[model samples]
Target: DVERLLCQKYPGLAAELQPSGACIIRGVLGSEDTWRRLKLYLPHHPALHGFQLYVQESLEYKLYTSANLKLQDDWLLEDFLDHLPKILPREGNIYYDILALYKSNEYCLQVDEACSMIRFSEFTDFEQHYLELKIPSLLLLDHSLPDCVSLGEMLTKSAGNLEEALNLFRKLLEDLRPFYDNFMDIDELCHVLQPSPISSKHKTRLFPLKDRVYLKLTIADPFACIASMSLKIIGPTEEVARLRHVLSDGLSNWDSEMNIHKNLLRMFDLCYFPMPDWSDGPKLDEEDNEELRCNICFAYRLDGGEVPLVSCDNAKCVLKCHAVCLEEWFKTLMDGKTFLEVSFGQCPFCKAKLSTSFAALLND
Candidate 1:
């Protein structure tokens, strides 16, 4: 109605408001030439926190104002991919689509210039609910959303009617609003609590299995505390900045390390396993090359305990680690930290370079 009223009142506004297949760019001094031109006109123009550039099939608009061309950020990669998803969409479910685009993927982490475009076009309230509820459940499990598992759970628990399941999830989230609202530092992750194998609630308890595991199928609200805090340290825009302020105020002294560890434990708890407790292992003798022999040392334990080792046959090295360990190690390296300060600068067992270079921190 407001759109209709505005269109009637302004006449030309409707044409301007029409949708474009053009790619929308967001964040930074979008083009070098524009920055140069803007400087010529307004030399003291404010520093660009972000901006938008549109790529279309034609040159109709005079907005191709800048001649500068440089790809300054990775946010656009997913944005381009997003516009081409029917051509090459990432694998798995809708929630997976969100997670892969925004979190787990190398380029899309934190800043979502492109995924936001996709969200603008396709993310329905139902998808919003799925991201809010289901992503967090997997986040509780392993930080990464368990797309296949969650999708399977959703399929089975929803009994085919995804719409009905979403409706139920919406009501449940409303019931649990207080818990999310109470978190000062995290984004309020909106998600649905389904009666799936992943949920911790009584309704979803698997009592028939020995030692019933209780957990909820949940989607996290985007306004939840964790994501809110993340906005400060790593978010891509001002709205994230606003969320970060809220999260920091709430989690003034929160322990992120402990949260990560606890989340890992939750993942271990939910995943089905077929092996004995690893700590109760077959001990290796001093002379017995544990590296060559033991299952524990050779294989990096993968998820659900069924698959453990991930082998890589790179020309650089022929070795393996529990994919989990590799992932954990990769994460640590990205943040410029490590537990062991080994002098050799290589993995003693595999002889791979532990000497991943750290970016030199410039003095302010």
Candidate 2:
């Protein structure tokens, strides 16, 4: 009667009520149209949340563990919550919580079913320590130090003693002056500065005055800066206005013999200037030509490239593409499948089976 009622109401959703009164979404959940119908049908059935919905992908019952509940859409919330305790074994002294896995070449979401992705629960010290370090803010460490890896090593060696690690990091910075000096180009300078997405470092142009005033400039694009650009000075309102006024006045008395231009402040000597374009070759796209290239990016495969290049399994189809690019394309090609379900999908050109693992290390 439960299955009949659900089938009658939702038309395409396959549901089964367990003997324990728990519910499960079985068989085909149908397409996006069916999903919409299921969402609307859910509110009427209060006991539907108690059902255990396992996504059947590639002949396997991939359980949607309690840890994955929070990531579910609003329509799935009650069902996942109600089904949690049914799958988890009772532990008198232990506690369990959700733990998210990081994305990598070795591991990625596989989706073949209609519902949400599989989840895992953790209750171990290993999981706790792993999460603590992954979160940058939790470490309470300075990010300005250029050698991030070295600082991380110090943090580990000192066993999270921030004070000792910071002192050591400062000493390391002092020794890197020679290395920093080699950064004469704009790209190199930006690398040394390593400004965050939000802001840049405060620098100073030497002044004739007894003390120097601070000034800062941010690059919109770290890699490419072409055409006439205006640099904004970030500072207190009064200071910025005053500096502009001084520059305007200095512009009127600019000296040609001294090779000084209008708005050149006599009080200061500029330390840095934006690099001019000096390209003598064709544009990157016009110059980069190779026999074999990624089907997605239409660019030559980089030598010793980090992203693996994969060929379609179908011998007939001549499709070679980057693993990351193909993975994204495959997910979209398999319509109505979530990221987890579409992780494994057929090749777009020839409909050949493809797996993330296949792209890890191509010998050729």
Candidate 3:
């Protein structure tokens, strides 16, 4: 019913233009399609906040018992919140309470599309997966950071922490130095900043100023950042008890020196019942109904881990693709080129253009 309403509201935003089928919406990045889905889900779901909390809980659940002794009770959201006031100035940055996972990959802060992607990513492929979602996600964190004048610095400077505030101000001014054109949209913003949706220290830019600000407030002076932080992952009380046991016993042989991400990847590979379906890619119709259903893959199901939705536009035009498909398609489009051109040429399967590639076919 909610899906149907989204289609009604956006008039073709819900499904692809051709394939006609019900698919899951979970793992994919946020696109106009995902926004359409949210419009449908947010209205009737009064417990949306609770739903978000569930995801955080799931991540924590996986993280705690995830075969990494180093991750043990290290920095729970509660710990961070308990310390928010000290390190960061009052009104430093108000979190809009996003329903996404904001975590540090290596030293970089990344906002993931969904909490489940980490669970599905194989350990051997983490570096590869890390490249896709590093920083600068659709959430547009980097773009906003520039707009965030150091309100904390301004206030503190006025209130006598002049030297400290001046230092912070200088840092902000330095970040704003290049002053490249502002991003009009998330896509362009992502391109300019190249925000990798993931945050692994090895392969990311590690924008130093932002990096230091986050750590100083979170890991360095835990009490200052943790006190004022409001977000907390919710779990069933019974599940918490179960988790305590799991943490105590499951990770008994954990190693501190092991890479936590690698360790979590291992546990997710082994423990999760069925590997969550993260393989779906974009579906395009080459022959007919190209305008409506092109270049978009379906999202995955976070709860209960179900089959991911491939863009099913209609009976005649539906073609399910996966991450491999997107990679291949992009590779095919960028064939023998130094850079990835925005245009995706004739369909790999059906040889349809103009109508098939949708608006994604930028000028070559």
Candidate 4:
């Protein structure tokens, strides 16, 4: 009788009493435009905290896990805690968290989206079946990353008989939707400082100061007021004492209430961070770009986002190379291998006696 009452109370909402004595709700909670299907099932407790509901999908189920907006609750008379606010809420939604797998380039496992102009990418799950999701994904073999691979895993794991899993899926999607804008702000802030996003992810940034000096930064929340920040600089340890003082002084000027980029301007005394020197020309000429170009890479700036920082001791044949590059070159020589801190090796181009504090370069 209670099941029939629910069916009669709502228009176009079909309520069926399942054989297992569960209430299966189908059809849109709102209007014809919302023509969707969901099943509201048994509640674990009278508090409604463990209320189980399922929404139909291309593959489906939704288990609402909140005590706030539920049906037949005591707060109904107040008209505040209604389902429409998030009910099949009036306020919230979902992000399709799935992956498509392929054998070769042929028709693959549920991975079909027709493209007029396509952005095609392939990424490994590092889990199994070579899945693909969230393309243009940062820091992965192709487009897939550990995070997206794991998200797809969570979505699938939740689908395992549907008890606690859908609750997690629901929670996962809800948290992901709200906090994206701050990351975008972080992306722009990194650009404002003329830094590169580490692995194309926005949270961490790498900024070059001079030739040899580099800075790494992290912001807890970019747009939020009183946002926290962390920084590390790699430079000449002795000369770095001066930049260290400057960095501390900058922190004294930090105002969490103001914009991050603006606050940093007063902090570091720089409008933007430095980018490594680079050039585009038809041919290499000693007189034209000698000092600016890294003698090792022969390019002014590396495609790997590197700049030559190590200089040869010989003034006449002074050549510059990236520390990581020099480190590899030094490992080849027996004498260079013996040194613990300063890996003294012959310069790549000029072949002069070179001594560099690999310790300073790595900042270990």
Give TM-scores for every candidate, taking all chains together and pairing residue i with residue i: 0.18, 0.21, 0.18, 0.38
* Candidate 1 lDDT trough over 10 residues, lowest sum: 355-364
Global CA lDDT computed for model 4: 0.46
Candidate with best TM-score: 4
Candidates in descending lDDT order: 4, 2, 1, 3
Residue-level lDDT of model 4, residues 1-364, one tens digit each, is 5445445555555656556544455555544456446555444221333455555645656556455344655532113122443445442111222222223342232333541111223222112113233222211122222232354555454433222332343344334332333334444544323232243224445555565565655555433324456765554444344566787887877775655555555667777655323553544554644476666567666665556666654667656666666655555553434343444556566766565443234321
| Candidate 1 regions with alpha-carbon error over 4 angstroms | 1-172, 175-315, 323-345, 355-364
Q: Give lDDT: candidate 3, residue 215.
A: 6
Whole-model Cα lDDT of every candidate shown, in order:
0.29, 0.36, 0.27, 0.46
Candidate 3 residues lying further than 4 Å off, grouped into runs, are: 1-163, 166-316, 320-325, 336-344, 354-364
Task: State candidate 2's TM-score.
Answer: 0.21
lDDT string, candidate 2, 1-364, tens digits: 6566556544555665456544555444443332221212232244333333355444365554336333334544334433433433342111111122333332222221331222211212111111122232224333442322354655565634322333454454444332222222333322121122211221211111111122222222222221111222222223434565665455455553432211233423444432224563445655533435777777654543422235444556665665455654543555565423544456677876554333222221
True-structure Cα RMSD, model 3? 25.3
Of 1 and 2, the candidate ranking higher by TM-score: 2
Tell me the spans in candidate 2 whose CA falls farther than 4 Å from its real position.
Answer: 1-163, 166-290, 301-308, 333-344, 358-364
lDDT of 3 by residue, 242-329 (tens): 3335443434544545422233224223332121133634333344433322244343322222211222223343454332335455
lDDT of 3 at 359: 21
